[PDB]
Write a protein that binds this ligand. Structure first.
Ligand SMILES: Nc1ncnc2c1ncn2[C@@H]1O[C@H](COP(=O)(O)OP(=O)(O)OP(=O)(O)O)[C@@H](O)[C@H]1O
Ligand SMILES: Nc1ncnc2c1ncn2[C@@H]1O[C@H](COP(=O)(O)OP(=O)(O)O)[C@@H](O)[C@H]1O
Ligand SMILES: Nc1ncnc2c1ncn2[C@@H]1O[C@H](COP(=O)(O)OP(=O)(O)O)[C@@H](O)[C@H]1O
Ligand SMILES: Nc1ncnc2c1ncn2[C@@H]1O[C@H](COP(=O)(O)OP(=O)(O)O)[C@@H](O)[C@H]1O
Lengths: 1622, 80, 193
């Protein structure tokens, strides 16, 4: 009864729970405490589910059921209200605090007044009764909240101009998006909400410090807790406007930094010119001032000391006080090194590290000066250095400090930078500093170029921070157009900030040329700012940006970092290149960056460690196997050195803890002296590099470690708690767990390596072949971390290539300049905002899919150390510390070095996930998860027990798979494809056993019968899964091998292969031939589209397809065109009444948009507590999306088919993403069947292995000569029953047919012409044509039958031929075949060469004389001239042949034509004449210069309306010249193949079409009311009435291109090669 | 065809010129400690892989030129 | 009126400037027109049916690109800009580009410094022709480097010589010029030891 007790507890909690309300400026009582309410709702929902788990639940089920509904409603309401409330808050602050908006924007001000009145009325109602249920019981409360949210969103979107004006007021607002700018402006009164926005407007100011009233700004703070206290605090009461006191805060920041720098310089002058420095005094001085201030003071003191020494030595013969400067530098460096050898606070530790770096640089410079015998302060060896001069006598504090390099002079910007990671100042950062400062003095930009991992982006940042500037890093891409770059320039010019545009060559060349104008005008303004003639008292320097006069600040600069070595990057125009000074940054000094980094981190042996670790990285680069995911560069050394520092700190802490818990004796010096720095460095190197290594490279790297670092061993930690959590998670997830060498030990080691990489890198890549355990690894790691650390783990899986890059990152509207968030941008922004506590959870964004530079190079700033998602609208999103960016990929063959270097790598091999692990997973799932949703569970357990011996190491299945991997398959063979096929078939076997038990309630299956059936079915499923996608020879080979290696009883037939046997439910092998009877087709059903003559292949493939479809498993039928894939699939689906099939016809231009249109037509999206679910409109029916050309869609330059990625995401993940609102949509009652030709066929691409893993492939080959003889002998016997005297000729005729077909299929192949494809489709058309000719006749001699046979052979096999010799061969071979199979006949009577048949001179289709036909056509042409078209035509024999062929096609249902010939040959005129003869109305699209896709859609709608609703027969004549875009061909392909375009009628057009269809059905007398029946009738009418005649020139490459762009032009259209006039 | 015969002769001559065998280096506990072996094993591995691929491609081209096997997409590209 | 081609507003500005200048007689220059071949065809068609002012000139600066329409090439007069044929031609072009008043300033040594700069530029650019031997790759040693070097020479000569008519050759900042040219002006493009 504990369920009842907990239900009563929940009832009492909700009856006592009230909304926590707090007053809001005496306007209303806003809801407070969203987190508690959400957590309570989630906990109660989880509890209710837990009770649903128990059986006793039933006695309370309904009540508990009722409860969840209320709970869900609560959540739903408060999933909106919070947002609404938040929005209203800031919107209120915009429409009340600001007075200019009422004059500027009155209409939506009144709108917001009305909505605010509604919101306050609702809040008053809530305040009257604060009960949660009472609020939930308000009538229409949910609808009211949704309407308020919609109206608030519209008003918020209607505030762009005000936001732009406010940005103009405060320039830093240019770096804040519209959402956050509205939040800042609205919440100006409540300053506590602005703290999270200061990081986007300032370099190092993450928050501001206020008093208890929050009315005076006392100072600023950084993200590390460092605080700067203002000398003159900023009062918010005196300056209520947000921008005014923000500007005052910025000015006071600069002034107080200058004053503190002056004080720090005055203090540090004591340490300078001092022989000995007390460590305590130096530490006190360091702690007193900020990091940038102490570094700047040290630089100023050293520069002044060197200047004084050089002035003293200016005499030449004087002494050398430069030695005094060097001695002072060395003494201070020794003090710093001693300080970092003991425990320090983290902020002071970073200050000491920065000071060590700066003083090492100073010592090197002073040693160089002494070695060069420098005695003059004007020597360029001293002038080329960066020298800091302080003038305390300057009245302006902002001008007291000057930084000079060569002739370049700069003023410190005094921007608060916080604590920035200082860069070792190597020789190339000195060359970079010199070149960039020379560019700045010339008022030019800087362009450091070179490979990636050289220092280009950081050296720019380090130079900007050295000058105290605000450096903004922008990750450029092709979407940074002229306007976005111009607005960014406006922001930078007004703020006075440095703009570092990395990957600048990723812009379009035209965009680079356009932006050159803005760069040039900006530089001209800066140059006129530099001239001393200008006075700041006059008008400020302004420039022409975006048709506006924008003030230019002297501190502004533009830098572009690019790698010109990447192929496919834009070439900068020379007029743009001349605006930048370029520098080659190719070889960083890795030896010095290490040495200095290890020296500053506290390593006593830093020089030895660096000299051992840099050559070690070179050795790893040049000795390990070359892999695409290997990176041994600078971003990988700095990743190792930082980890070494962290590991040394952790080891010191551990040693101190051990000393504390074992006696009381702690000494920093003793620990520092007795510390294995070698072992620490090796541990970091291993933890960083081992996960990326392949199996063969691990011993090589460990041998390299032993060679370079002898005597030190890497003993990895035993993470016992994490391993226990992993074991529990694997146990509950049916996954195999192993320790060390046990089964699964490699996988668990990979999981632990992934965990280690997560802690070091915020960007990860799990690289490995399909089915290597990557997904399971990171899922199990996430769950184990959630259970261990107690932090909830949320994973957002994004397929980056299943959607366009615009849908992935976002779109800037070229007209209104409005930003629409993409998928990744929306997810990241939602995490950053943390409206629902997303910052307290472990967020993992997994980019599962293909990686190419186009989409992933936008993530360079994210996966770098900028951790910024830079958008073209100037917005920058900081990556939260709890967010990991993950890439689950199968290869990195297209990713560049920049991507590989920025991320940690974990390499999963196919050996990591052994086959025993997969077998164990399958058996555990079978024994645990019932198949129905227990007799079914018992059946599964017994079957799993029976299959246990074969699912072992070196078992039947393993040996069979190993052998099958050596065969030849129509598609690339992967282990998991075969294993999934086998597992689905075994599930079908268990379901068959359950069905047999249900059919025999009294006598169920016993143990021995079950064993026999399961063993035989296991052999059968192994055969059909490991060789289903291979020819008959390979199936026989696999059967023979299994017979060799198995102990299961097998059929004893001497020569019949095992593939010809099925397993009956009685536990015995039975031949498939027993299910293939000699049927007798009805005469009226001869060669009908839905008539299938059963054969061995037909029944076998039908059974296999039923097995795969009943499991709702996506499947693929691969085979030659016309083999019978669609026929077999439809015949198999006929046995599944609860499955409705929808046919899609893929082409080269197919995108996921076709699938989305099909979903919008046949399915619906519904909102459920678990999310959005897309399900078919029909209830209880499964939608089968049959895609006919899955491997045709275009593969980009990076080897990815977007629609294939979409289908793979929808199968593997069970859903997709709606890009309208970036919402995960889960598929329900939807499965996938695909059909394709072999990938070796022209225009066909090999499907991805990740996609092929989820889809079993069955190879449907052409029926053999015996199979063809059987099928078409049955058809001919059925057909010839019309004329009894011809019945005895049924056997020979078929043979002749088959023979000729074979001959043609051997003579004309795709090598000659692309359209030379002969299939059983031609034989079916042959039978259909002969039957149609013979149907009206009451009697006919054999000669007439042979004449009809020859005529149909000519029409089917000769009309498509290009050359004359081919047609002559066809004529001669028809004659020879007919004489061979029909001897003793009148040769001349049945083979007079003008074989013409027509129904124009009679009621029936009988042979027609050429002269009589010519006279009749002449008369009809006279009538045609006098009525329709007065263009006289000369009649010759080929014209008669062509008009007869066109009439034949026009008399067929869904009869489309493809007339190929030279222009002016008469194709269009003859088509029009024949259509007029047959009564068809000719429709041609009037294409002009402004004809677009919308016009073609309208014309298609008109044609479909006329031919489907009005029952009008229409000949739609279309020429290749009418095709202006590929969308034309896509819609034409869909219409030709199916008879209906899925997305053509939408919106009110669909309603009008439905009304017209209802009217037409009423006219026809049909009772149709439902939209589905109306659309089916419309499609049938369009199929029966519309004849599309496509005309094109006989181009060589054009025909091959069209064979893939529009496949239905060669499968649904009868091809007639008119050619040129002979 | 003329180009078919020319390509057949060229591929046969190339197969005659190119060697046929290249055995991978053998891993040993003391061989790994030698950097020269650590480099020569990579050299021989890449050489053997490339040799096998080139020999298979040329054999396929010769087979196509005699008409024994059908042209595939990769074979068409290689022949072109 | 100088307009850089590549943007739709760029095309609008080009059209407006041409329409204004064909009446006012001013000059219009359009840069990188090879990036818009279709707009180039439209511009040629517009130019053919036009009677501009006597002083109107339309300069179209582009790179040698096959995408440039043939009709535009036939409609206009083509001038090819390329490296000068030799050392003498290079030095003549350099001395023509630099204004006389700039070289003939207060220090008499400025002329010799400019001559040495011109000779250095000519030698480097001529060595660019022999790609593997003269250099290691086709560096973009061009007019911008020469202008930067001239600016550096002017700056440091005016720094050392405080308006004096003559400066001793020992006092010329040779180290400054050499280091700035080796590390910043010409050595910036160099990525080879
Ligand atoms: N520890 C394990 N024990 C047993 N089976 C496992 C284990 N981990 C994964 N598998 C199974 O092995 C197969 C590999 O699936 P997984 O999702 O891990 O592969 P993947 O590397 O993501 O492949 P892809 O690159 O195609 O996404 C699946 O059947 C999976 O359930
Ligand atoms: N002089 C240096 N001292 C310390 N770290 C450096 C130095 N130069 C480069 N780095 C590091 O090298 C890595 C790559 O540098 P970055 O400038 O981001 O590369 P890129 O030039 O490809 O844009 C970063 O971790 C950066 O901090
Ligand atoms: N056993 C059979 N009974 C009837 N028709 C068959 C049989 N085997 C093959 N065919 C013929 O093969 C052709 C298959 O074409 P289709 O179903 O479109 O296949 P695909 O999609 O593979 O091209 C049809 O003309 C069909 O009549
Ligand atoms: N047999 C013919 N006798 C006379 N004129 C013909 C004949 N066939 C075609 N034409 C000419 O073709 C012209 C139009 O060509 P059309 O039939 O549209 O060919 P296409 O569509 O292939 O370009 C007519 O104006 C007519 O003069």
């Amino acid at each position: 009864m504990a369920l009842e007790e907990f239900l009563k507890q929940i009832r009492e909690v909700w009856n006592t729970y009230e909304l926590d309300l707090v007053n809001y400026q005496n306007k209303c009582r806003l809801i407070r405490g969203w987190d508690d309410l959400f957590n309570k709702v989630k906990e109660h929902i989880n509890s209710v589910s837990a009770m649903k788990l128990s059986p006793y639940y039933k006695v309370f089920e309904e009540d508990a059921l009722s409860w969840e509904d209320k709970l869900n409603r609560i959540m739903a309401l408060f999933d909106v209200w919070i947002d609404v409330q938040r929005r209203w808050v800031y919107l209120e602050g915009i429409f009340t605090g600001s007075a200019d908006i009422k004059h500027l924007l009155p209409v939506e001000t009144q709108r917001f007044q009305s909505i605010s009145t509604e919101f306050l009325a609702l809040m008053k109602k809530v305040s009257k009764s604060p009960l949660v249920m009472d609020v939930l019981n308000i009538q229409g409360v949910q609808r009211s909240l949704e309407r308020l949210a919609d109206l608030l969103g519209k008003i918020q979107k209607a505030l762009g101009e005000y936001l732009e004006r406010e940005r103009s007021s405060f320039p830093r607002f240019y770096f804040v998006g519209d959402e956050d700018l509205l939040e800042i402006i609205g919440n100006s009164k409540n300053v506590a909400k602005l703290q999270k926005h200061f990081k986007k407007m300032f370099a190092g100011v993450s928050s501001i410090i206020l008093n208890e009233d929050n009315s005076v700004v006392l100072g600023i703070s950084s993200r590390e807790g460092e605080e700067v206290m203002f000398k003159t605090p900023v009062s918010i009461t005196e300056h209520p406007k947000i921008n005014e006191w923000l500007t005052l805060v910025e000015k006071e920041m600069r002034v107080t930094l200058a004053k503190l720098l002056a004080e720090s310089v005055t203090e540090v002058e004591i340490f300078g010119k001092a022989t000995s420095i007390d460590p305590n005094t130096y530490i006190t001085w360091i702690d007193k001032y900020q990091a940038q201030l102490v570094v700047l003071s040290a630089q100023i003191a050293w520069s002044e000391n060197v200047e004084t020494a050089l002035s003293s030595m200016g005499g030449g013969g004087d002494a050398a006080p430069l030695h005094s400067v060097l001695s002072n530098v060395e003494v201070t460096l020794n003090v710093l090194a001693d300080s970092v050898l003991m425990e320090q606070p983290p902020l002071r530790r970073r200050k000491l590290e920065h000071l060590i770096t700066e003083l090492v640089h100073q010592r090197d410079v002073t040693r160089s000066l002494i070695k060069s015998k420098i005695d003059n302060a004007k020597s360029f060896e001293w002038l080329s250095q960066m020298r800091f001069y302080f003038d305390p006598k300057q009245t302006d504090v902002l001008q007291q400090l000057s930084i000079q390099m060569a002739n370049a002079k700069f003023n410190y910007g005094f921007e608060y930078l916080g604590v920035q990671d200082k860069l070792v100042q190597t020789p190339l950062t000195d060359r970079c500093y010199l070149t960039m400062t020379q560019a700045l003095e010339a008022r030019l930009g800087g362009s450091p170029f070179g490979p990636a991992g050289t220092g280009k982006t950081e050296s720019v940042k380090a130079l900007g921070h050295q000058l105290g500037r605000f450096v903004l890093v922008f990750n450029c891409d092709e979407t940074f157009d002229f306007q976005a770059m111009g607005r960014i320039f406006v922001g930078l010019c007004q703020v006075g900030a440095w703009g570092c545009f990395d990957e600048f060559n990723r812009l379009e060349e035209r965009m680079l040329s356009a932006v050159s104008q803005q760069v040039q005008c900006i530089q001209e303004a800066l140059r006129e700012h530099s001239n001393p003639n200008y006075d700041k008292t006059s008008a400020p320097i302004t420039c022409e940006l975006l048709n506006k006069q924008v003030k230019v600040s002297p501190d502004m600069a533009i830098f572009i970092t690019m790698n010109p070595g990447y192929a496919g990057r834009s070439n900068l125009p020379d007029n743009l290149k001349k605006l930048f000074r370029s520098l080659a940054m190719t070889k960083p000094d890795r030896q010095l960056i290490a040495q200095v980094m290890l020296y500053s981190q506290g390593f006593r042996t830093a020089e030895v460690l660096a000299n051992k670790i840099v050559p070690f990285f070179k050795l790893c680069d040049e000795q390990l196997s070359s892999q695409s995911h290997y990176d041994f560069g600078l971003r990988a050394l700095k990743s190792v050195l930082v980890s070494a520092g962290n590991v040394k700190r952790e080891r010191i802490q551990k040693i101190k803890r051990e000393k504390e818990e074992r006696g009381e004796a702690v000494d920093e010096g003793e620990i520092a002296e007795n510390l294995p720095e070698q072992e620490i460095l090796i541990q970091s190197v291993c933890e960083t590099m081992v996960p990326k290594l392949v199996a063969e490279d691990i011993p090589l790297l460990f041998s390299l470690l032993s060679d370079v670092f002898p005597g030190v061993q890497y003993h990895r930690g035993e993470m016992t708690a994490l391993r226990e959590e992993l074991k529990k998670v694997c146990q509950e997830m049916y996954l195999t767990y192993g320790d060390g060498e046990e089964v699964g030990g490699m996988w668990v080691e990979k999981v632990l390596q992934l965990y280690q990489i997560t802690q070091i890198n915020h960007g990860l890549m799990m690289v490995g072949p399909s089915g290597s355990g990557k997904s399971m690894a990171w899922r199990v790691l996430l769950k184990a971390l959630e259970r261990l650390e107690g932090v909830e783990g949320v994973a957002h899986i994004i397929d980056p290539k299943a959607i366009s890059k615009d849908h992935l990152y976002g779109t800037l509207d070229p007209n209104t300049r409005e930003w629409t968030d993409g998928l990744f941008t929306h997810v990241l922004r939602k995490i950053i905002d943390s409206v629902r506590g997303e910052l307290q959870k472990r967020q993992w964004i997994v980019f599962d899919g293909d990686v190419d530079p186009e989409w992933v190079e936008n993530l360079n700033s994210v996966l770098d150390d900028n951790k910024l998602l830079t958008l073209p609208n100037g917005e920058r999103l900081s990556l939260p510390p709890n967010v990991r960016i993950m890439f689950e990929v199968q290869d990195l063959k297209y990713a560049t070095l920049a991507t590989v270097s920025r991320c940690g790598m974990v390499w999963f091999s196919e050996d990591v996930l052994s086959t025993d692990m997969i077998f164990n997973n399958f058996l555990a799932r079978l024994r645990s998860i019932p198949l129905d949703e227990s007799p079914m569970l018992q059946i599964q357990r017994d079957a799993a027990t029976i299959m246990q011996p074969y699912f072992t190491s070196n078992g039947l299945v393993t040996k069979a798979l190993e052998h099958a991997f050596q065969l030849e398959h129509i598609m690339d063979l992967t282990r998991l494809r075969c294993l999934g096929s086998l597992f689905s078939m075994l599930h079908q076997a268990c379901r068959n056993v359950a069905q047999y038990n249900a059919n025999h309630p009294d006598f169920p299956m016993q143990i021995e019968q079950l064993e026999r059936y399961i063993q035989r079915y296991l052999v059968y499923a192994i055969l059909w899964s490991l060789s289903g996608d291979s020819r008959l020879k390979m199936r026989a080979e696999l059967g023979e091998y299994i017979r060799r290696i198995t102990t299961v009883p097998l059929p004893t037939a001497p020569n019949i292969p095992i593939i010809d046997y099925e397993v009956s439910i009685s536990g015995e092998w039975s031949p498939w031939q027993a299910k293939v009877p000699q049927i007798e087709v009805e005469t009226h059903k001869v060669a009908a589209p839905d008539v299938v003559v059963p054969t061995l292949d037909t029944v076998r493939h039908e059974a296999l397809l039923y097995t795969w479809l009943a499991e709702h498993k996506p499947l693929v039928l691969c085979g030659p065109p016309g083999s019978g894939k669609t026929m077999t699939l439809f015949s198999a689906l006929r046995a599944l009444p609860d499955m409705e099939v929808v046919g899609l016809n893929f082409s080269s231009a197919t995108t996921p948009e076709l699938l989305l249109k099909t979903f919008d037509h046949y399915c619906e999206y519904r909102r459920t507590p678990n999310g959005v679910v897309l399900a078919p409109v029909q209830l209880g029916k499964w939608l089968v999306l049959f895609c006919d050309e899955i491997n045709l869609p275009d593969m980009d330059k990076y080897g990815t088919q977007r629609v294939i990625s979409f289908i793979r995401q929808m199968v593997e993940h069970g859903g997709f993403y709606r890009t309208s609102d970036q919402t995960w949509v889960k598929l329900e009652r939807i499965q996938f069947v695909g059909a394709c030709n072999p990938p070796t066929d022209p225009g066909r691409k090999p499907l991805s292995h990740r996609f092929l893993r989820h889809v079993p492939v069955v190879y449907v080959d052409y029926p053999g000569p015996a199979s063809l003889t059987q099928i078409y002998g049955t058809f001919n016997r059925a057909m010839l029953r019309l004329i009894p005297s011809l019945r005895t000729y049924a056997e020979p005729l078929t043979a002749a047919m088959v023979e000729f077909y074979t001959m043609s299929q051997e003579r004309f192949t795709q090598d000659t012409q692309p359209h030379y494809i002969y299939s059983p489709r031609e034989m079916t058309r042959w039978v259909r044509g002969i039957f149609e000719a013979l149907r009206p006749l009451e009697t006919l001699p054999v000669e007439g039958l042979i004449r009809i046979w020859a005529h149909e052979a000519l029409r089917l096999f000769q009309d498509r031929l290009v050359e004359d010799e081919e047609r002559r061969w066809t004529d001669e071979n028809i004659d020879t075949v007919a004489l061979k199979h029909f001897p003793n006949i009148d040769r001349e009577k049945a083979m007079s060469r003008p074989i013409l048949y027509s129904n124009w001179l009679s009621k029936d289709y009988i042979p027609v004389d050429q002269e009589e036909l010519r006279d009749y056509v002449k008369a009809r042409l006279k009538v045609f001239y006098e009525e329709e078209l007065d263009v006289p035509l000369v009649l010759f024999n080929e014209v008669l042949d062509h008009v007869l062929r066109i009439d034949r096609i026009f008399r067929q249902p869904q009869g489309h034509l493809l007339l190929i010939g030279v222009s002016g040959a008469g194709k269009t005129t003859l088509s029009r004449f024949v259509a007029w003869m047959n009564g068809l109305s000719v429709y041609q699209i009037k294409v002009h210069r402004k004809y677009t896709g919308e016009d073609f859609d309208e014309d298609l709608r008109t044609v479909l309306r006329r031919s489907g609703c009005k029952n009008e027969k229409i000949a739609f004549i279309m020429d290749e010249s009418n095709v202006l875009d590929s969308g034309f061909l896509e819609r034409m392909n869909t219409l030709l193949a199916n008879g209906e375009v899925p997305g053509l009628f939408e919106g009110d057009e669909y309603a009008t079409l439905m009304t017209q269809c209802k009217e037409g059905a009423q006219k026809e007398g049909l009772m149709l009311d439902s939209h589905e029946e109306l659309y089916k009738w419309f499609t049938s009418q369009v199929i029966r009435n519309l004849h599309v005649v496509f005309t094109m020139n006989p181009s060589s490459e054009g025909l091959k291109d069209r064979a893939a762009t529009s496949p239905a032009l060669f499968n649904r259209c009868v091809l007639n090669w008119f050619g040129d006039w002979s | 065809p003329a180009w078919m015969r020319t390509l057949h002769t060229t591929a046969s001559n190339w197969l005659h010129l190119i060697p046929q065998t290249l055995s991978h280096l053998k891993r040993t506990v003391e061989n790994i400690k030698d950097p020269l072996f650590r480099f020569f094993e990579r050299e021989v591995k890449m050489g053997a892989k490339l040799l096998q691929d080139v020999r298979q491609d040329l054999a396929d081209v010769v087979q196509v030129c005699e008409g024994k096997k059908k042209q595939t997409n990769y074979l068409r590209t290689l022949i072109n | 009126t100088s307009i850089a081609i590549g943007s739709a507003e760029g095309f609008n500005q080009a059209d407006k400037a041409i329409n204004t200048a064909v009446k006012s007689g001013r000059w219009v220059m359009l840069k990188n027109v090879h990036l818009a071949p279709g707009w180039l065809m439209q511009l040629e068609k517009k130019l053919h049916s036009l009677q501009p002012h006597a002083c109107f000139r339309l300069f179209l600066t582009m790179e040698i690109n096959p995408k440039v329409p043939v009709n535009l090439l036939r409609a206009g007069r083509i001038f090819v800009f390329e490296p000068p044929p030799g050392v003498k031609a290079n030095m003549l072009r350099t001395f023509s580009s630099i204004p006389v008043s700039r070289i003939c300033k207060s220090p008499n040594e400025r002329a010799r410094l400019y001559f040495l700069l011109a000779w250095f530029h000519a030698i480097i650019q001529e060595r660019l022709r022999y790609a593997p031997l003269g250099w290691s790759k086709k560096y973009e040693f061009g007019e911008s480097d020469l202008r930067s070097a001239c600016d550096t020479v002017d700056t440091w000569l005016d720094d050392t010589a405080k308006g004096r008519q003559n400066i001793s050759p020992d006092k010329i900042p040779w180290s400054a010029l050499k280091t700035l040219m080796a590390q910043s002006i010409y050595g910036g493009r160099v990525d080879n030891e």
